[PDB]
Amino acid sequence: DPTQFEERHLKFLQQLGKGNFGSVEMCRYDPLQDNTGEVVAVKKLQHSTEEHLRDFEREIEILKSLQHDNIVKYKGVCYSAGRRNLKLIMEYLPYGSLRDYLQKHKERIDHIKLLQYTSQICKGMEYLGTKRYIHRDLATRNILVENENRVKIGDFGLTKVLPQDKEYYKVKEPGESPIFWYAPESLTESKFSVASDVWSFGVVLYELFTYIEKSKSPPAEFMRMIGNDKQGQMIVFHLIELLKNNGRLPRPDGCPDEIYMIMTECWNNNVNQRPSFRDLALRVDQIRDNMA
Ligand SMILES: Nc1n[nH]c2ccc(-c3ccccc3)cc12
Numbered sequence: 525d526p527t528q529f530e531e532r533h534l535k536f537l538q539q540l541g542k543g544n545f546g547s548v549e550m551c552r553y554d555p556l557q558d559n560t561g562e563v564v565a566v567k568k569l570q571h572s573t574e575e576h577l578r579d580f581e582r583e584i585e586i587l588k589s590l591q592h593d594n595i596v597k598y599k600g601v602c603y604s605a606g607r608r609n610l611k612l613i614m615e616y617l618p619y620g621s622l623r624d625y626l627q628k629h630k631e632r633i634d635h636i637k638l639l640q641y642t643s644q645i646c647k648g649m650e651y652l653g654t655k656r657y658i659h660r661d662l663a664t665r666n667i668l669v670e671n672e673n674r675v676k677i678g679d680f681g682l683t684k685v686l687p688q689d690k691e692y693y694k695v696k697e698p699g700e701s702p703i704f705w706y707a708p709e710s711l712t713e714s715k716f717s718v719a720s721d722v723w724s725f726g727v728v729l730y731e732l733f734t735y736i737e738k739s740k741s742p743p744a745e746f747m748r749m750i751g752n753d754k755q756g757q758m759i760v761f762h763l764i765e766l767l768k769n770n771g772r773l774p775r776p777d778g779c780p781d782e783i784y785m786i787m788t789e790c791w792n793n794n795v796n797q798r799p800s801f802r803d804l805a806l807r808v809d810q811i812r813d814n815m816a
Contacts, residue, residue, distance in 0.1 A: 527600035529553060529613050534566060534602070541621070544661070544681040544700065545569060545576055550616055564599055567612040577610065584612050586657060586683050594648030596668060596678045617676060619669035626664065627736040635780065636815055638732050641667075641675045643808045648677040649725060650801035653718045656686040658693055660716050662724040663705055664731045684716065692717040703760060704742040708767045708793055711760060722798045726790025733776040733783060745773050767793065782811055 533555040540548040546567045554561035569576050588598045602611035619625055622641065626633060645667060652659060660682040668678035684693045695714040707723035709715045727742055734740040747754070749771050750762035772791055775784045786807065792798045799807075 543679045565614040565616045592651045594644045617668040617670045622667040623664040625669045630735045639812045646805040719795045726787045733779045
């Protein structure tokens with residue numbers, strides 16, 4: 525069974541970053557101990573408590589159930605003897621996160637390339653929604669670059685399955701929340717749906733067309749709009765009030781009008797009025813086609 529990975533054969537190579545409750549490391553799976561084994565990405569929990577272990581195991585099952593070109597590939601799991609610590613083994617994508625990639629190359633990644641990525645992100649999200657999963661954490665830091673032509677959604681640490689008879693998931697005790705990517709109803713009511721994922725996708729699109737410029741980041745811009753003096757819980761209060769009054773991120777400099785229109789449609793206060801991922805993928809592909 526190639527999906528069974530023995531821990532003692534995993535050699536640390538380097539850190540790939542922190543993903544909320546876990547950390548990711550590039551490791552070589554080297555059972556021959558001759559440095560010829562496959563390089564893989566290993567996700568593990570920083571604090572592997574009961575509750576966290578339970579959530580991590582659901583995360584692993586979620587990822588194992590997804591097979592798509594634009595979703596990072598599940599490879600297997602590590603089990604520890606005794607207390608049953610879990611490690612998630614995934615394919616290694618060597619160009620790193622889209623956030624770092626775009627921050628590095630900036631405008632050398634042209635609009636044609638940005639829209640190819642948008643389309644791939646859209647397709648990965650559409651497929652996710654057909655499984656009734658809600659991502660809840662869609663941001664360029666959670667998207668990975670395989671090569672110049674392909675990106676994949678790379679982390680599913682906050683992903684939840686919808687109840688059979690509901691079209692939203694409600695979070696009763698929120699943890700660390702990426703509030704600057706949140707839809708209004710997620711801020712006010714902790715309600716998460718395909719439509720709040722679409723809102724966050726609008727924010728991802730904004731990130732892409734600002735080329736991850738620090739002064740233009742969603743946190744920087746929303747803080748500017750509510751006032752940099754706002755702190756802690758008051759940030760959430762003022763953000764809710766800003767969004768209610770149609771305060772929005774500005775059009776990135778140089779952004780095509782058709783692309784900006786997509787963002788603004790995703791950021792609808794009316795949940796039902798937001799576009800679908802199926803339609804967004806059709807629209808982006810048409811725009812790419814017009815440009816080519
Ligand atoms: N470079 C990668 N190849 N495969 C991966 C799987 C997960 C993450 C990751 C996700 C969130 C935070 C940090 C790293 C990174 C990679």
